[PDB]
Amino acid sequence: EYLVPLDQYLAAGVHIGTQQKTKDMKKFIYRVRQDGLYVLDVRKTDERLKVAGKFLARFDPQSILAVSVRLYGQKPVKKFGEVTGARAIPGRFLPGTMTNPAVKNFFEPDVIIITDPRADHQAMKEAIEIGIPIVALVDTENLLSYVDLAIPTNNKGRKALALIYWILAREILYNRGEISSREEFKIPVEEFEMKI
Amino acid sequence: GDPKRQRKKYETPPHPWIKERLDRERVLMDKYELKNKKELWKHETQLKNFRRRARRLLAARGKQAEIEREQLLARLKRLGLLPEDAVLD
Amino acid sequence: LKFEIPVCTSCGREITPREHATHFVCPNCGEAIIWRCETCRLLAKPYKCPKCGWEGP
Amino acid sequence: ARMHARKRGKSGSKRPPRTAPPIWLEYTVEDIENLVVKLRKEGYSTAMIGTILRDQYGIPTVKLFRDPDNPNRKLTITRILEKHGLAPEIPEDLMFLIKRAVNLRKHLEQHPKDLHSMRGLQLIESKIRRLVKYYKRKGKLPKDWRYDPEQ
Amino acid sequence: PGKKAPNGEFAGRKLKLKRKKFRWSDIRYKRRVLRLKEKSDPLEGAPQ
Amino acid sequence: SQEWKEYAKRVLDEWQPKTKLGMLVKEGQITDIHEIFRKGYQIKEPEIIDVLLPEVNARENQEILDIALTVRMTDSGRRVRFRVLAAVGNRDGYVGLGIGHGREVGIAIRKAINYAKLNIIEIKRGCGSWECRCRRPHSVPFTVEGKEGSVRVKLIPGPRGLGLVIGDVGKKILRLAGIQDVWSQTLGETRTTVNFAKAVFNALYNTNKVVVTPEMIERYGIVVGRAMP
Amino acid sequence: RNVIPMPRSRFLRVKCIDCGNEQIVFSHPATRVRCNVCGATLVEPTGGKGIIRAKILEVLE
Amino acid sequence: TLLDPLANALSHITNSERVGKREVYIKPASKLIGEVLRVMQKYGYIGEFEFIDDGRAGVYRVQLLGKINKAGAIKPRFPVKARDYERWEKRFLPAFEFGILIVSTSQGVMSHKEAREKGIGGRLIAYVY
RNA sequence: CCCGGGUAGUCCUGGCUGUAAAGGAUGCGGGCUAGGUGUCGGGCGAGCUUCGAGCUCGCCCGGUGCCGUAGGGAAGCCGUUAA
RNA sequence: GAGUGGUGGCCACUAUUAUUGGGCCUAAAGCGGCCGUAGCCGGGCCCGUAAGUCCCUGGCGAAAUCCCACGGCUCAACCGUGGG
Ligand SMILES: [Mg+2]
Ligand SMILES: [Mg+2]
Ligand SMILES: [Mg+2]
Ligand SMILES: [Mg+2]
Ligand SMILES: [Mg+2]
Ligand SMILES: [Mg+2]
Ligand SMILES: [Mg+2]
Ligand SMILES: [Mg+2]
Ligand SMILES: [Mg+2]
Ligand SMILES: [Mg+2]
Ligand SMILES: [Mg+2]
Ligand SMILES: [Mg+2]
Ligand SMILES: [Mg+2]
Ligand SMILES: [Mg+2]
Ligand SMILES: [Mg+2]
Ligand SMILES: [Mg+2]
Ligand SMILES: [Mg+2]
Ligand SMILES: [Mg+2]
Ligand SMILES: [Mg+2]
Ligand SMILES: [Mg+2]
Ligand SMILES: [Mg+2]
Ligand SMILES: [Zn+2]
Ligand SMILES: [Zn+2]
Ligand SMILES: [Zn+2]
Ligand SMILES: [Zn+2]
């Protein structure tokens, strides 16, 4: 039914949005509280995580790029790349990484994962130019422009980002057949998150 | 009004000194041993008039248009410029 | 023979030579190819797989 | 927009589309005509009669019944009053505007320096003359009728 | 400025009057029709 | 076509590609020019065009549209720069336009030719004139427009044998694309050559934006890219 | 959807507290609504929706 | 104020197609708008359409398919004779048989191709291509 | 130009004059074409409340600002308060 | 090229007169503001009329001048017989 119980989703704060809203995000929004804060629907998150796990398992592993400027997302993307074999770029994204072949670390992926369209704007801009599919994590305040596959979640919290990337890595492993069952994946969620 | 005035049968170039046109016309003048430019221009005009009649007859319809259409083809094959089975295009 | 010009899955217009379009296999089933033109991507138009019926960006 | 002030207000009524009277309305046409005559004899305007009928008697507009005499048309309050001889001699909107203009003119006799209110009198009299042109065209006013404040 | 006017099917007279009115703003047209050059030419219109 | 085939062979074997599309071309997974368009690829290596369309390196298929010298002011005098506008094509259905800069004319010419290749486009050709309905790809298939700066350009289908009724810059560009006859109308400052050329190039590109039906393809003789007898 | 205009007001079936008479009245009046039998007040008008002083029995279509 | 219901409808359709709308509502309806829509549907420029009844002059709901380059009214409504269609085609259309001019005749509303086949003139009211 | 004085005028009543960078340097009416975020008036819903014509959040209509997508423009820039 | 230059005029160039087809925030250009007469432009449905409008057919708009084919001057310019 669910990849994890809804209690863990709620305790990790996946459903907590922001005081701002956007017209194209309303298909994912569940309700608004009395203090003006918008809440996300968690069943949609589970469905999109399953679909995203199926989509990403079909690409060649070293052709996947994951990025995260925001500090609370840096350890999760590094751990995701270590587990799945995907390239991972935490911190400042050097302009021209995907458009300037003369640069030392020039790299053209086949698919890109964006932690936040607002903060990772340089990576998204360069990815539009080279015509690859874009997968993104979207909060209540984000727009859906140039997003080809959207995953609705809180993308600012430490525990939520840890949980999202942990689930996504497990789904990829299960879908490509490197683990024969879900129970086999014995890597705790706490290893994806930043400490202190 | 004004009575009739007899008009030139040939047209002059819109600009006297264009390099490409000068080269092309010099080649023609040398090859066919024509006496002056106007002689060449005369023949050019004849060609233009033929094309202008075909362009007008393609976009026409009715009874006089057909008669004119067949007269143009007949005259062109009498002069030997088209074979016996040619069409308007 | 000649070649076929690709057509956007959402709106059905042809893809022009140098626009910022994209194409990918269906995320849900993987049996069909989705094309999205620059205008549909910019406005976040929804799309629907012609085989399994899963819809949306 | 508003004829002179050029504002774009939108408030108004939102009538649902329907043909017959609703099932829950029990009054017949004869009761409704009797009510209209009684209210008019109490001294109300045609707009006020409809307001009272809607608010107190639960009657959405009388324009839900066919005219018992002429099947070509529906019933209106003015048509009902005409059928009994109690219809206004001057059209009501013109009458209300003329009444507003008379009150304002005696204010201006005592306040000759109140120029902003005078422009209001000018606008009101423009409205009055538009209406008199329309009504003479339709034959609801005699051809010799004229508007003169000194009357 | 709104749409250029008049565009109506039965507004021929006004359109013609508009074109006539603003043609006098063209100094070429005004000088020819009023014959201003002839009025001041010492050669009286001659080429030599 | 015997020369440029071996030129393409020579370029291919001594070339080490630095981009993904260049690798697809190097390994024989792409063999035709039409396969690089309409999928969002970034084109950053000039060797791609040299292998797939080798005839853009001929002298008859290149035109230097204009050369200007521009000035930057300093406390030690005037610093001079060259700007070159150039175009290339295959005279069938592919055309490109580029701008180059340099301290000497030759550097600017080299860079301008290089950028024209990288800006290559494919167009549509046909016959749409009321007074010539011949289904051959000698003109534009229908009326189109383009613009740049103050310049507006409108291109109109013309009869076979008319010639190119347009200013000289437009003549050169249209000839490189493989079009023989056209009518035209312009607004704005055509003496600004950079803008004139860009407006014509945009008009040619815009033949891809008109919606058409299968019936229309037969009626106007529409051809995409090479005529391909 | 909202192409057709639909009102936000309603007609209500109410019962007088004092007389016991039953009536049908409008929810957004512009006058004081009084009982058709005894004359007691049933709805007081305001800027928008009226203040109902009677017992509401049914909301009519 | 409102002067021309048909011009509003066609400008509305051309604005909507440029941003990828899948349907539109034409707010003041009339019989002439209905005839124009029937002709547009016959040549494949629109999908299904339906009349919706308010208490007012009615509404049209129309399905769009992204097949319209441009559409607009012709003002004033010029009269035209049965053998004079070509110059109007060159005025409003991009190639010799590209698109349709919509004509009001005493035999009804029809495309200029059908009217030319019947041998009749009329009044120009719209163009679509 | 700065400093010490100073007539007309600046103020009220009844008239005349009809001029300003009287500038939003942008004539007026109607239909249509992504969003986001403040603020003023009215209405509706919900929750608080010291029960106040009080406070907080959301939505509709009409005013008044800012950022900005398509499109426009020589550009500065305008962008449902359209240029 | 038996011609080729100078001076003055009209058309084009010129979408620098704009019906087709131009402009008016900062470049020439929105009356300081508003009310309203003539004129122009005007919401949906049903029935009648037939002035505008479209189609068919009678009587007219001299000849010369213009376009096409054929014929006579060696061909042509020119002139005749037919069609427009
Ligand atoms: Mg005489
Ligand atoms: Mg210095
Ligand atoms: Mg530009
Ligand atoms: Mg100019
Ligand atoms: Mg003093
Ligand atoms: Mg002031
Ligand atoms: Mg100011
Ligand atoms: Mg002014
Ligand atoms: Mg408020
Ligand atoms: Mg105000
Ligand atoms: Mg507002
Ligand atoms: Mg802005
Ligand atoms: Mg101008
Ligand atoms: Mg003004
Ligand atoms: Mg007025
Ligand atoms: Mg009407
Ligand atoms: Mg008649
Ligand atoms: Mg004659
Ligand atoms: Mg002889
Ligand atoms: Mg002869
Ligand atoms: Mg003769
Ligand atoms: Zn699309
Ligand atoms: Zn599928
Ligand atoms: Zn042709
Ligand atoms: Zn009672």
From Swiss-Prot, chain A:
GO terms for biological process: translation. It comes from the Archaea. It comes from Pyrococcus abyssi (strain GE5 / Orsay). Keywords: Ribonucleoprotein, Ribosomal protein. Gene3D superfamilies: Glucose-6-phosphate isomerase like protein, domain 1. This is Small ribosomal subunit protein uS2. Pfam families: Ribosomal_S2. Belongs to the universal ribosomal protein uS2 family. One of its GO terms (cellular component) is small ribosomal subunit. GO terms for molecular function: structural constituent of ribosome. InterPro entries: Ribosomal_uS2, Ribosomal_uS2_arc, Ribosomal_uS2_CS, Ribosomal_uS2_euk/arc, Ribosomal_uS2_flav_dom_sf.
From Swiss-Prot, chain F:
This is Small ribosomal subunit protein uS5. The N-terminal domain interacts with the head of the 30S subunit; the C-terminal domain interacts with the body and contacts protein S4. The interaction surface between S4 and S5 is involved in control of translational fidelity. Part of the 30S ribosomal subunit. Contacts protein S4. Pfam families: Ribosomal_S5, Ribosomal_S5_C. SUPFAM superfamilies: dsRNA-binding domain-like, Ribosomal protein S5 domain 2-like. Residues 60-123 form the S5 DRBM domain. The keyword 4Fe-4S does not apply. GO terms for cellular component: cytosolic small ribosomal subunit. The gene is rps5. With S4 and S12 plays an important role in translational accuracy. InterPro entries: Ribosomal_Su5_D2-typ_SF (IPR020568), Ribosomal_uS5 (IPR000851), Ribosomal_uS5_arc (IPR047866), Ribosomal_uS5_C (IPR005324), Ribosomal_uS5_euk/arc (IPR005711), Ribosomal_uS5_N (IPR013810), Ribosomal_uS5_N_CS (IPR018192), Ribsml_uS5_D2-typ_fold_subgr (IPR014721). GO terms for biological process: translation. It comes from Pyrococcus abyssi (strain GE5 / Orsay). Keywords: Ribonucleoprotein, Ribosomal protein, RNA-binding, rRNA-binding. GO terms for molecular function: rRNA binding; structural constituent of ribosome. Belongs to the universal ribosomal protein uS5 family. The keyword Manganese does not apply.
From Swiss-Prot, chain G:
GO terms for biological process: translation. The keyword Transcription regulation does not apply. The keyword Zinc-finger applies. Pfam families: Ribosomal_S27e. GO terms for molecular function: structural constituent of ribosome; zinc ion binding. It comes from the Archaea. Binds 1 zinc ion per subunit. A zinc finger (C4-type) spans 16-38. InterPro entries: Ribosomal_eS27, Ribosomal_eS27_Zn-bd_dom_sf, Ribosomal_zn-bd. Its cofactor is Zn(2+). GO terms for cellular component: ribonucleoprotein complex; ribosome. Zn(2+) binds at residues 16, 19, 35, 38. Gene3D superfamilies: Zn-binding ribosomal proteins (2.20.25.100). Keywords: Metal-binding, Ribonucleoprotein, Ribosomal protein, Zinc, Zinc-finger. PROSITE patterns: RIBOSOMAL_S27E (PS01168). Belongs to the eukaryotic ribosomal protein eS27 family. HAMAP family: Ribosomal_eS27. Part of the 30S ribosomal subunit. This is Small ribosomal subunit protein eS27. It comes from Pyrococcus abyssi (strain GE5 / Orsay).
Curated annotation (Swiss-Prot), chain H:
It holds the Pfam family Ribosomal_S8. It comes from Pyrococcus abyssi (strain GE5 / Orsay). The keyword rRNA-binding applies. Part of the 30S ribosomal subunit. This is Small ribosomal subunit protein uS8. One of its GO terms (cellular component) is ribonucleoprotein complex. GO terms for biological process: translation. It comes from the Archaea. One of the primary rRNA binding proteins, it binds directly to 16S rRNA central domain where it helps coordinate assembly of the platform of the 30S subunit. GO terms for molecular function: rRNA binding; structural constituent of ribosome. PANTHER family: 40S RIBOSOMAL PROTEIN S15A (PTHR11758). Disulfide bonds: none annotated. InterPro entries: Ribosomal_uS8, Ribosomal_uS8_CS, Ribosomal_uS8_sf. Belongs to the universal ribosomal protein uS8 family. Keywords: Ribonucleoprotein, Ribosomal protein, RNA-binding, rRNA-binding.
